[PDB]
Amino acid sequence: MTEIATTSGARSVGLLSVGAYRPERVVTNDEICQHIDSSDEWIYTATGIKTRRFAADDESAASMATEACRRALSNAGLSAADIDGVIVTTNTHFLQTPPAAPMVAASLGAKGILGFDLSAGCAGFGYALGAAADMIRGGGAATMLVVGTEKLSPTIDMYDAGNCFIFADGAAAVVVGETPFQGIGPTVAGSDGEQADAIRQDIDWITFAQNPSGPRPFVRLEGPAVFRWAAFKMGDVGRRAMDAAGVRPDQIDVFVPHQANSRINELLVKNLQLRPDAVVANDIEHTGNTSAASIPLAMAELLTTGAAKPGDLALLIGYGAGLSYAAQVVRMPK
Amino acid sequence: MTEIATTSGARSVGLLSVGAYRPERVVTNDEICQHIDSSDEWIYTATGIKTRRFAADDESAASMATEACRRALSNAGLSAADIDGVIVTTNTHFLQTPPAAPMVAASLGAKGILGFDLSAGCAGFGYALGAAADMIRGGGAATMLVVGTEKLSPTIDMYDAGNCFIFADGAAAVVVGETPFQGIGPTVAGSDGEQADAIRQDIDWITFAQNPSGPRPFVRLEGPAVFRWAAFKMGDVGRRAMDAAGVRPDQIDVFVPHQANSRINELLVKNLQLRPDAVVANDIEHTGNTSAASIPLAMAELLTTGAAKPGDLALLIGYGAGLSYAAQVVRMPK
């Protein structure tokens, strides 16, 4: 006979701001061509990557998230006191525990707010953004920080001519909160665990710890499998995201697919049939593939250069590791 | 002028069932404390732990989660096809990527469903349950699997007399779906990022990998500090959870605090002012502290012994690493 109470928050939520942080060190294609048999021109034409950013030895996924969050808050004209929760989405927090979220919250002056780490491969941002919107509309929070951060450089095998030039470091955060009108569309997501090996850490940490003299872990990438999967299936996920958002393809002002490979994204543009003048994120050129931090970093690049503008309707499509994807239509932040 | 659409789902949701998997191997206190000369009785008197289960070498956080989910599905009279998404909460998936969720979904035959891994230290379950409820009410899924799973045994330092006897292995999943009347109360969560070192892996994986000859990483647990914090703060957390759920202390039929210390749980029962005949979860006796899987495993133990019955009003309070906590009032599942 006892009835559990039901709570609810603001139905209309949106991106109040985006803040980005990219490590200082610039690493050129030729800088890694010392241990690989390819060239600078080959890399660019195959991936679209010219340069990449590597974080300093004293930096981590957590420290870069702190920096990204401070910038997002500043750009939103808010402080941690206005934040009710923080979701850190990453794949490079090199500690089984504790999670990064609490320490990140403390570093902003809000050591006590709720928060957790979200891992869904490269698509962690999409899932995190959706979970934040879900929590806020549900009344569990009013304003949140969602920060994608990655320090992939230490996981790269310089001798792997297959991906040594793909991954990079960086972090970008968005402030999610109430907005006059809906700014975040329904979440469209899924996965394919049958191809979980397409992007992976080859040796688990325990197997390594129980035999420290053997081969150490490194990130491996089966290029052909990822290309075939993403290039041919993300078109349909993108249409599902727009449909769920109740928007037509021609109404999309900006397209921000995961910055995994220029060639894959170029095919997605053709497949999605967006307006000929739609702006497409190409932050991969000098940022490389920063996994979970990829789309928020790309959004920031588009906004700081003027290519994209506040209010623009953007199609976000994250795809990657575990072979999971998350997409949604959103209104670009300020 | 374009209006981003808003979707909606079942307003009332609850735990349809719970499924638990406890590895076969029983490990006595002397077995992990054979490397220390401490009293067998002292461990039980101080923490309430007698034995714990350790997973086999061919098992992992992911494989145990899969089995837990199969059982949860069976107990709810549902099939993998009835599941729209799965959230795996753990702190012992020893791979930076790919995440465990896609793999678990594939293994269950729940092809392509959305999913992700959530790490909030030991309180991952409460956060994941709250996220599942939020996603369902938001219309992003109708029925979900939330599974806590941990394989902490490989991270235990047999020579650490401070925590060698604390952690254990196991997994438990719940099915979250629409229900006639609200079954999941509002989420009450938070943390203390300034005490991130209280429970932690002492050496990050990269530092170790760059010095394989040096010391191996292990999970450290500062008992004094963690229990001091728990005793001091969980009482208020429990009250906020009950208040949010609109229920009085005398209305709770089952109390399911994290299984970390029996004495603390006794202290909380009193502080929370629950009825003397309220059933208190003590699965810790032969399960130990299974971190993220602790609460759902404790719910199952209470239900399989008959101590608790489906429909009973229960108070869940998770707390642990990163110094996170997550609590909510819920109706016990099948």
Q: Which residues of A are catalytic?
A: 122, 258, 289
**Are B138 and A137 within 8 A, CB to CB?**
yes
**Contact between chains at B98 and A322 (C-beta distance less than 8 A):** yes
CA A285 to chain centre: 16
Task: Supply A135's token pair.
Answer: 């929590």
Within 13 Å and on the Cβ side, how many CA atoms surround A297? 33
C-alpha to C-alpha distance for A60 and A153, rounded to whole angstroms: 10
Nearest CB partner across the interface for A187, out of B96, B140, B207: B140
What residues in A contact B202, CB-CB < 8 Å?
A: none
Residue A144 in contact with residue A73, Cβ under 8 Å?
Answer: no
How far out from the chain centre does Cα B286 lie?
Answer: 16
Closest CA to A120 of B11, B176, B102: B102
Query: Does the beta-carbon distance from A101 to B219 stay under 8 Å?
Result: no
Residue A152 corresponds to which amino acid? L
8 A C-beta contact, residue B219 and residue B163: yes
* Residue in the block written with tokens 């292990």: B218
Q: How far apart are alpha carbons A79 and A108 in whole angstroms?
A: 8
A61 burial (CB, 10 Å; 0-12 / 13-18 / 19+) is buried
A83-112 residues touching B, CB cutoff 8 A: 85, 91-92, 94-107, 111-112
Which of B97, B119, B216 lies nearest to residue A116, judging by beta carbons?
B119
Query: A126 with A234, same domain?
Result: no
Is residue B33 part of the annotated active site? The answer reads no
- What stretches of A167-293 show up as alpha helix (H) in DSSP? 205-209, 223-245, 262-272, 284-287
Contacts of B305 (CB under 8 A, 6+ apart): none
Q: Which of these, A330, A202, A236, A238, lies nearest to B2 by C-alpha position?
A: A330
Burial state string for B224-243 with b = 16 or more CB within 10 A and e = fewer than 16:
eebbebbeebbbebbbebbb
Q: What does DSSP say about strands B85-89 and B51-54: parallel, antiparallel, or unpaired?
A: unpaired
Of B138, B164, B182, which marks where a domain is finished?
B182
Kindly state whether residues A26 and A171 are assigned to the same domain. yes
Q: Taking Cα atoms as reference points, which of A174, A202, A191 lies closest to residue A17?
A: A174
Measured CA distances, B72 to A68, A130, A297, B321, B330 (Å)? 40, 26, 39, 26, 17
In CATH, what number is assigned to the domain containing residue B256?
3.40.47.10
Inter-chain CB pairs, A–B, below 8 Å: 307
Q: Are A170 and A270 in the same domain?
A: no
Closest listed residue to residue B191, CA positions, set B328, B330, B327: B327
- Residues paired with A178 in a beta bridge: A13
Residues B139 and B198 occupy one common structural domain: no
Would you say B287 and B168 are in contact if contact means Cβ atoms under 8 Å apart? yes
Which one of the listed residues B258, B261, B265, B282 is annotated catalytic?
B258
Q: Give Cβ neighbours of residue B312 (< 8 Å, ≥ 6 apart).
A: B253, B254, B279, B331, B332
d(CA B60, CA B94): 9
Find tokens 């525990």 and name the residue. A97
Identity of the residue in B155, B324, B330 whose CB atom sits nearest the CB atom of A102:
B324
Which is it for strands A279-280 and A254-257: parallel, antiparallel or unpaired?
parallel
Same domain, A201 and A130: no
Taking a contact as any Cβ pair under 8 Å apart, which residues of chain B between 231 and 270 contact chain A? 244-247, 251
B69 in catalytic set: no
Q: By the 8 A CB rule, do B215 and B307 touch?
A: no
Interface of B with A in 205-234 (CB under 8 A): 205-210, 212-213, 216-217, 219
Please tell me whether residues A189 and A82 are part of one structural domain: no
Interchain CB contact of B120 with A (< 8 Å) = yes
Test A121 with B97 for CB contact under 8 angstroms: yes
Tokens encoding A259: 């910055």
Q: Sort out which chain B residues have CB atoms less than 8 A from A115's CB and list them.
A: 120, 191, 324
Distance of alpha carbon A156 from alpha carbon A212, whole angstroms:
18
The helix (run of H) or strand (run of E) holding residue A149 is strand A143-151
Tally of CB atoms within 10 A around B324: 33
3-state secondary structure of A223: helix
Q: Say how far apart CA B178 and CA A136 lie, in whole Å.
A: 20
| Bridge partners, B144 (sequence order) | B85, B176
CA angle in degrees (0–180, nearest 5) for B161-B165-B171:
150
Task: Please list the helix, strand and coil fractions of chain B in percent, rounded to the nearest 5, in that order.
Answer: 40, 25, 35
Q: Are residues A75 and A172 in the same domain?
A: yes
Chain B residues closer than 8 Å to A197 by CB? 98
Q: Considering B122, B163, B164, B282, which one is annotated as catalytic?
A: B122
Q: Are residues A84 and A190 in the same domain?
A: no
Which of B123, B157, B182 is where one domain is finished? B182
State in Å, rounded, how far the first CA of chain B is from the last one.
Answer: 48
CA dihedral B311, B331, B269, B131 (to 10 degrees): 160
d(CA A68, CA A75): 11
Q: State which amino acid sits at residue A270.
A: K
Q: Is A192 on the interface with B (CB under 8 A)?
A: yes
Among all chains, which residue has been given the structure tokens 């690049």?
A301
* B50 and B117 belong to one structural domain: yes
The residues with which B189 forms a beta bridge, in sequence order, are B326
Using the Cβ of A326 and the Cβ atoms of chain B, whether some distance falls under 8 Å is answered with yes
Instruction: Look at residue A251 and give its three-state secondary structure.
Output: helix
Select from B179, B185, B175 the least CA-distant residue to B84.
B175
- Say which amino acid occupies B62: A
What is the distance between the alpha carbons of residues B200 and B191, in angstroms, rounded to a whole number? Answer: 15
Residues of B in contact with A225 (CB under 8 A): none
Are B144 and B89 in contact, with CB atoms under 8 Å apart?
no
Which residues on chain A are in Cβ contact (under 8 Å) with B94? 96, 204-207
Identity of residue A214 = G
Phi and psi torsions of A189, nearest 5°? -150, 170
**Within 10 A of B122 (CB to CB), how many other CB atoms are there?**
34
Q: Do A4 and B102 touch (CB under 8 A)?
A: no
Residues B175, B277, single domain; the answer is: no
Element spanning A103, H or E? helix A100-107
Q: Give the best residue of A4, A87, A113, A207 to mutate against chain B (max B CB count within 10 A).
A: A4
Interface contact B154, partner A, CB < 8 A: yes
| Cα separation, B85 vs B69, whole angstroms | 12
The number of folded domains in chain B is 2
Identify the domain containing residue B162 by its residue range.
1-182
Same domain membership, residue B53 and residue B161: yes
Could you tell me where the DSSP H helices lie in chain A?
29-32, 40-47, 61-76, 100-107, 124-137, 205-209, 223-245, 262-272, 284-287, 294-304
Experimentally, the structure was elucidated by X-ray
If we measure between CA atoms, which residue out of A295, A92, A79 comes closest to residue B97? Answer: A92
Residues of B with Cβ-Cβ distance to A210 under 8 angstroms: 154
A143 touches chain B (CB under 8 A): no
Report residue A328 as tokens.
């949604």
Q: Could B134 and A130 be called an inter-chain contact, meaning their C-beta atoms sit closer than 8 Å? A: no
Specify the residue for token string 């957590």.
Answer: A62
Q: Which of B182, B201, B219 is the last residue of a domain?
A: B182
The gap from C-alpha B239 to its chain's centroid, in whole angstroms, comes to 20
End-to-end CA distance of chain A: 48
Asked if B259 contacts B294 with a C-beta cutoff of 8 angstroms, the reply is yes
State the Cα–Cα distance between residues B237 and A253, nearest whole angstrom.
45
Q: How far is B262 from chain A (nearest CA, A)?
A: 23
Collapse the DSSP code of A60 into the 3-class scheme (helix H, G, I; strand E, B; otherwise coil) and give the result.
coil
Q: Which residue of A has its CA nearest to B89?
A: A118
Two tokens, residue A244: 């769920």
User: Coil, strand or helix: which one is B170?
Assistant: strand
The first and second tokens of residue A10, run together, are 């603001």
Contact A101 B191 (CB under 8 A): yes
Sign, CA torsion B274/B278/B283/B285: positive
The single-letter DSSP state of residue A278 is: -
Give the C-alpha separation, B136 to B113, whole Å.
Answer: 14
Secondary structure (3-state) at A4 = coil
Check CB contact of B182 with chain A, cutoff 8 Å.
yes
Which of A64, A204, A17, A313 has its CA nearest to residue B97? A204
Structure tokens at B283: 């699965």
- Partner residue facing B209 (CB), from A111, A217, A326: A217
Q: Which residues of A244-254 are buried (b: 16+ CB within 10 A; e: fewer)?
A: bbbbebebbbb
DSSP A334: -
Q: Quick one: B249 and B111 in the same domain?
A: no
Beta bridge partners, A219, equal A201
CA distance A259 to B96: 19
Using CA atoms, how far apart are residues B267 and B258, in angstroms rounded to an integer?
13
Q: How many CA atoms does the CB half-sphere of A12 hold within 13 Å?
A: 7
Report the alpha-carbon distance of residue A85 to residue A291 in Å, rounded. 22
Nearest to A324 among B102, B154, B331 (CB): B102
